[PDB]
C-alpha cells in the first residue's frame, strides 16, 4: 500500500 | 497480422533464444515483465500464463489478483546484447481477467477501448509521432550518475563530432538494427540533450515503440558509461525535456484533418479536435505531466508551454499546427513530457478530441501577439488561461473533469489519483536543502 | 552536375554508409546538421525532410519555424574516420520555405541571390581563394586546451621537421585523400601558427571547402592530442590569424580584371571593384570581423590592416594586388579573419564590388609611403581613414550603410545585429582580471 | 532568445 512512504 | 504462432516458433528455434520477457506497463509507466524459459513459449502462446495483476496498480497495490498474460505476436523483438548463452526476446502482452475479459486497469486495454470508441464514431486510425528528448550524464567511479553532462553542445550543433564517442550515433544505429523507423536525430538546445524522431505509426504501436526506445536508450547509454535520463527538468535554469505528440486522425478516404477548401487548409474535424483539446487541457494536464518535477519544466522562458492557446507560429504554444499538409496534416501537443505514460496520455487526448468532435465545439482564435508580453490579468480577459502550476492543482482539475475520468476508466482513475496524492503528500512534508540555505543562517 | 541521385545511391550502397549528416551554416557561422540513417536517404533526395529553421538564427531564435532541407548532390563527401560499423557521409543542404521558396535567412541562399545579381549584370563567376591560418595548442590531462603552443616555429621555417608529429603534414595528407585541392602549406610568423592554401574555385564551393576544412582540421588535431583554433588573436603580443581572400571576377571572354593595355595591367572593371571595396570597407568591416576578439587583431605592428588603403607592395594594406596577371589576376582583401562566416563575407564583398562597378567610381591613388610613419591627423588629410576600432563602432557603421544591408537581406541583417549587440553588451558589462590587476591594489 | 546572458 505505502512502500514509497 | 504480421506474425503467427508458427512464425514465432520458427524464430525462437532459428535464433536460439532461451529466455522470453513477457512485458507490460503499469499505471505509473514503469515497464514490468515476467521472465519464462523458451520451453514455456508454447504455453505463453496459448494465453495460459497466470501472474499477479495487482503489480499494474504499482506501489498502491493491496490484494493479490490473478490475471492472464495474452501476448501480442506482432511485438516479437530479439535483443542483440545477449552474448551466446541463449538470446532474449520480448513480446508486449495484454492483461485479461480470469473470465476471459480484458482487464480494465491495464493502460493498453484502456487505449484499445478508446480506439474502439473512435472507430465506432467513424474514423479508422489515430497516427502518432512522438519527439522524445533525453539527457546524458557521466557516470562516477561506482557506476552512479553524476551531474556532469557528456558534452556542451547546442541546438542542431555538430557537437559530438566524429572520432569515437557520439553516443547518439551509436544509439540510432542499434535502433535501426533492431528494426526501428527513425526519421532524424539531432542535438537539443540544452548541453547534453539529444532528440531522436520516429516515424508515424498507430497509437498502440507508437506507445510500444516509445517504451522500447526508452529501454534501449537506457541500456546503450549504460553500455558506454553514461546515464540516459528522461526526467522533464533534471537541472535548473536549463531547457527541459519534452515529448511533443504529433497526432493525425484518419478515415476511409484519407486524412480527416486535411481540407483544401477550408481555412488554413484544415477541415472542420481538425477544428473540432482543437476545440476539444483546448477545452479539457486543464483536465488532462495531470495525466500528461504526472510527476512533481514535470511542473518545474512548465515555466516561462524555456519554450515549454504555459498557457492554453494554439497557434501556427508562436513562442511556445500549447498546441502547434505544423505547416505540412496533405496526408501529413497533424496537430502537435507540446505539454507532454517523456515521464508520462504513453497509453494514458493517448487515451485522454483521444477522449478529449472525440468529445470536441461530438459536441462540434468552435475553437478560439489563434494567438500570435506574444502572449508573454502582457501580464496575467491583461491576458485573462481573453480566452488565454494558465496551466496548473503544481501537481496538486492538476489533480484537483482531474477530480473535477468528467470526460477525462470516462477516458481513463474508474479503476485507472482511482489508482492514479491515490498514487499521485501519496506522491504530493510525500513531497509537501519533506525539508529540502533549499530551505536550509535560505533560512538556517538568517533565522 | 557532377553527381545524380543514382550516383548517390550507388555510392551509399558500395561504401556501406549507415549515417548521413545533412549540414548547413547558421548566421553566426557555426556548422549545424541533422543526422539521418541511410534508410531515409531516398527521402532526403526528394527534398522532403523537415526541420526547425529557427536554428539558423542562432541563440536569438524565438519561434519554431518548419523548413525544408534541399541537399546539394555535388557536396557528397564520405568521412574516413568512421571505423567499420557503417560510414558517415555529408551533404551541404539549402534551406527552403514550406511554399517551395528558398529561405531568405539562409546565408547560402543569400550568396546565391547575390551571385544571381552578378550574373544579371553580365559576369559569369566569382572565383575565390582563401588563405586561412590556425593555431595549434597542446591538450591537458583532461583533454582540455592549454596555452602552450605545439612548436616554437617561424615564418616559412622547417620547424616541425621529420620523425613523427608534424600535424600539418598529416592534415594536408588527409585533406588530399578526402578530395581537397591543396596548393601549398607552410609555417606562419607566430609560433604554433600554420597556413594551408587552397585552389581557386567558385564562391559557393570555396565557402563549403572552408567549412569542411575547419571541421576536418579540428577533428584531426583532436586525433593527435592537439587543439586547432581559428580565433583571430588567441594571444597578446603575437601575430594574429587571418583569412585573406583572393577574389577574381570572370566573364564569357575570360578574366574581367585583366587588361594588357591598362595601367598596372588592370582593367577598368578591376578599378571600379577596388573603388567599391574601399568605399564600403567601413561598412562591411563588421561582417568580415564579427567577433570581439577580431578587433584585437586589427592593431598596428602585426601586419594586420588598420587603414582603408590599397597598394601593390606595402606593409599591411587593406587591399593588395598580387603581381600575377593573366587568368590569375585577382584582388586580395586582408581584413577577413577565420572567425567570419564565409557566405556573408562573400555576399557583402560582392555587393560592394558590384555597386562600385555600377557607379563607375574612381579608386584613390595607391599609397606606398609607409602610412604608419605619419600620425592619424597627418594621414586623415588624405583619403586614408581608420577601420573601426571596436565591434560596436562596426555595428554602427553597418546600421548606417544601406548597400551592405541590401546585400545581407533584412532577415539576416536584423538577426546579425541583434546577436552582435547582445555580444557587445555581454562583453561591456563583464569585469576582467586585467581590471583587478590594474586597480585592486592601487585603489 | 538569450541563453548566452
Ligand atoms: N527547441 C525546442 O522546441 C525544444 C523545446 C524544449 N526542449 C521542451 O522540452 O519543450
Ligand atoms: N606573413 C603574413 O602576411 C601573416 C599576416 C598575419 N598572420 C595576419 O593574419 O594578417
Ligand atoms: Mg525538440
Ligand atoms: Mg515539436
Ligand atoms: Mg599568411
Ligand atoms: Mg595573403
Automatic annotation (TrEMBL), chains B, C:
The modification O-AMP-tyrosine is found at residue 372. L-glutamine 3 binds at residues 133, 240, 297, 303. One of its GO terms (biological process) is glutamine biosynthetic process. GO terms for cellular component: cytoplasm. It catalyses: L-glutamate + NH4(+) + ATP = L-glutamine + ADP + phosphate + H(+). Residues 15-100 form the GS beta-grasp domain. It is an enzyme of class 6 (ligase). The keyword Phosphoprotein applies. Mg(2+) 1 binds at residues 131, 133, 188, 195, 244, 332. Its EC number is 6.3.1.2. Its cofactor is Mg(2+). The keyword Oxidoreductase does not apply. ADP 3 binds at residues 198, 200, 246, 315, 320, 327-329. Mg(2+) 2 binds at residues 133, 188, 195. ADP 1 binds at residues 198, 200, 248, 315, 320, 328-329. ADP 4 binds at residues 198, 244, 246, 315, 320, 327. SUPFAM superfamilies: Glutamine synthetase, N-terminal domain, Glutamine synthetase/guanido kinase. GO terms for molecular function: ATP binding; glutamine synthetase activity; metal ion binding. ATP binds at residues 183, 198-200, 315. Binds 2 Mg(2+) ions per subunit. It is found in: Cytoplasm. L-glutamate binds at residues 239-240, 297, 303, 315, 334. It comes from the Bacteria. ADP 2 binds at residues 198, 200, 246, 248, 315, 320, 327, 330. Belongs to the glutamine synthetase family. This is Glutamine synthetase. The lineage of its organism: Bacteria, Bacillati, Bacillota, Bacilli, Bacillales.
Amino acid at each position: 500500500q505505502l512502500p514509497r512512504f | 497480422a504480421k506474425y503467427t504462432k508458427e512464425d514465432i516458433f520458427r524464430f525462437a528455434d532459428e535464433q536460439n533464444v532461451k529466455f522470453i520477457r513477457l512485458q507490460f506497463t503499469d499505471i505509473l509507466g514503469i515497464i514490468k515483465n515476467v521472465e519464462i524459459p523458451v520451453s514455456q513459449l508454447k504455453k505463453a502462446l496459448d494465453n495460459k500464463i497466470m501472474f499477479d495483476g495487482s503489480s499494474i496498480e504499482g506501489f498502491v497495490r493491496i490484494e493479490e489478483s490473478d490475471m492472464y498474460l495474452f501476448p501480442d505476436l506482432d511485438t516479437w523483438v530479439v535483443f542483440p546484447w545477449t552474448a551466446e548463452k541463449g538470446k532474449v526476446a520480448r513480446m508486449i502482452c495484454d492483461i485479461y481477467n480470469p473470465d476471459m475479459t480484458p482487464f480494465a486497469g491495464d493502460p493498453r486495454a484502456n487505449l484499445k477501448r478508446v480506439l474502439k470508441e473512435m472507430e465506432e464514431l467513424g474514423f479508422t486510425e489515430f497516427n502518432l509521432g512522438p519527439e522524445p528528448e533525453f539527457f546524458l550524464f557521466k557516470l562516477d567511479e561506482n557506476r552512479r550518475p553524476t551531474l556532469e553532462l557528456n558534452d556542451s553542445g547546442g541546438y542542431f550543433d555538430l557537437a559530438p563530432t566524429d572520432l569515437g564517442e557520439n553516443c547518439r550515433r551509436d544509439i540510432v544505429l542499434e535502433l535501426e538494427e533492431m528494426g526501428f523507423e527513425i526519421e532524424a536525430s539531432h542535438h537539443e538546445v540544452a548541453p547534453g540533450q539529444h532528440e531522436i524522431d520516429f516515424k508515424y505509426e498507430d497509437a498502440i504501436t507508437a506507445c510500444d515503440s516509445i517504451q522500447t526506445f526508452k529501454l534501449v536508450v537506457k541500456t546503450i547509454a549504460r553500455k558506454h558509461g553514461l546515464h540516459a535520463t528522461f526526467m522533464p527538468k533534471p537541472l535548473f535554469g536549463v531547457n527541459g525535456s519534452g515529448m511533443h505528440f504529433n497526432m493525425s486522425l484518419f478515415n476511409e478516404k484519407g486524412n480527416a484533418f486535411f481540407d483544401e477548401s477550408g481555412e488554413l487548409e484544415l477541415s472542420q474535424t481538425a477544428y473540432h479536435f482543437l476545440a476539444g483539446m483546448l477545452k479539457h487541457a486543464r483536465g488532462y494536464t495531470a495525466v500528461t505531466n504526472p510527476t512533481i518535477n514535470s511542473f518545474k519544466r512548465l515555466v516561462p522562458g524555456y519554450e515549454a508551454p504555459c498557457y492554453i492557446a494554439w497557434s501556427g507560429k508562436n513562442r511556445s504554444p500549447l498546441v502547434r499546427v505544423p505547416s505540412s499538409r496533405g496526408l501529413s496534416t497533424r496537430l502537435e501537443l507540446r505539454s507532454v513530457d517523456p515521464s508520462a505514460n504513453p497509453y494514458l496520455a493517448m487515451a485522454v487526448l483521444l477522449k478529449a478530441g472525440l468529445s470536441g468532435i461530438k459536441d462540434e465545439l468552435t475553437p478560439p482564435a489563434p494567438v500570435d501577439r506574444n502572449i508573454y508580453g502582457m501580464n496575467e490579468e491583461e491576458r485573462e480577459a481573453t480566452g488565454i488561461y494558465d496551466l496548473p502550476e503544481s501537481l496538486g492543482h492538476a489533480l484537483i482539475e482531474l477530480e473535477k473533469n468528467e470526460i477525462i475520468k470516462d477516458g481513463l476508466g474508474e479503476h485507472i482513475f482511482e489508482h492514479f489519483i491515490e498514487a499521485k496524492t501519496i506522491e504530493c503528500d510525500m513531497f509537501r512534508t519533506a525539508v529540502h536543502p533549499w530551505e536550509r540555505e535560505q533560512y538556517l543562517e538568517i533565522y
